[PDB]
């Protein structure tokens, strides 16, 4: 659902931002996050769910 | 008034958990707000914490600072509308204060306890 993603991805994107070390780790989280936003406004829910799965992975890796 | 002195306890706690910042608690904050608000409240909440936002606490405070909330006075307007006025405070693990501000939280709610926040507007003083 589009709302359910916005809250989930926002949290996810926070905890990735907080854990990221150099600016090269921050750049990737900031873009993924904005892309998950850009895609939800374009109503690409099936796509945003995957960019959220990429953000969700970057979060597995950072722990 | 047996109900309003209760509605005031729920109203303090909501403004505390919502306007606090402890980075080790964000998932419970979110969970708390999720279960105490309507979906536009809960969403504007999230659209404020997102790192897309320049003014987000996560961007400003990160892992160094920790925001605290002191409840000053509640203005009970009616049974579904209240105005909590409060003080913020940002200090690091050293104690050096950075932010100290005065805020009004203009709330609309419903309570039987089932407490739900239907509206939330902030104002700086």
TrEMBL record, chain B:
Residues 1-121 form the Bacterial virulence protein VirB8 domain. One of its GO terms (cellular component) is membrane. It comes from the Bacteria. Keywords: Membrane, Transmembrane, Transmembrane helix. It is a single-pass membrane protein. It is found in: Membrane. This is VirB8-like protein of type IV secretion system. It comes from Rickettsia typhi (strain ATCC VR-144 / Wilmington). The lineage of its organism: Bacteria, Pseudomonadati, Pseudomonadota, Alphaproteobacteria, Rickettsiales. The chain holds residues 91 to 226 of 232 of the full protein.
């Amino acid at each position: 659902n589009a709302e359910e993603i916005t809250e989930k991805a926002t949290l996810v994107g926070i905890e990735a931002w907080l854990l990221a070390k150099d600016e090269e780790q921050k750049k990737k989280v900031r873009t993924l996050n904005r892309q998950v936003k850009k895609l939800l406004q374009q109503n690409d829910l099936d796509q945003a769910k995957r960019v959220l799965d990429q953000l969700k992975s970057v979060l597995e890796d950072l722990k | 008034n047996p109900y309003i002195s209760v509605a005031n306890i729920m109203l303090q706690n909501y403004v505390k958990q919502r306007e606090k910042y402890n980075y080790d608690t964000l998932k419970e904050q979110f969970t708390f707000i999720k279960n105490a608000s309507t979906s536009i409240v809960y969403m504007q909440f999230a659209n404020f914490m997102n790192i897309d936002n320049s003014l987000s606490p996560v961007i400003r405070y990160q892992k160094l600072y920790r925001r605290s909330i002191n409840i000053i006075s509640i203005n009970n307007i009616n049974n579904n509308e209240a105005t909590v006025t409060f003080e913020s405070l940002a200090q690091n693990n050293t104690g050096e204060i950075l932010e100290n501000m005065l805020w009004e939280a203009k709330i609309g709610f419903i309570m039987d306890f089932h407490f739900i926040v239907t509206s939330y507007k902030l104002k700086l003083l």
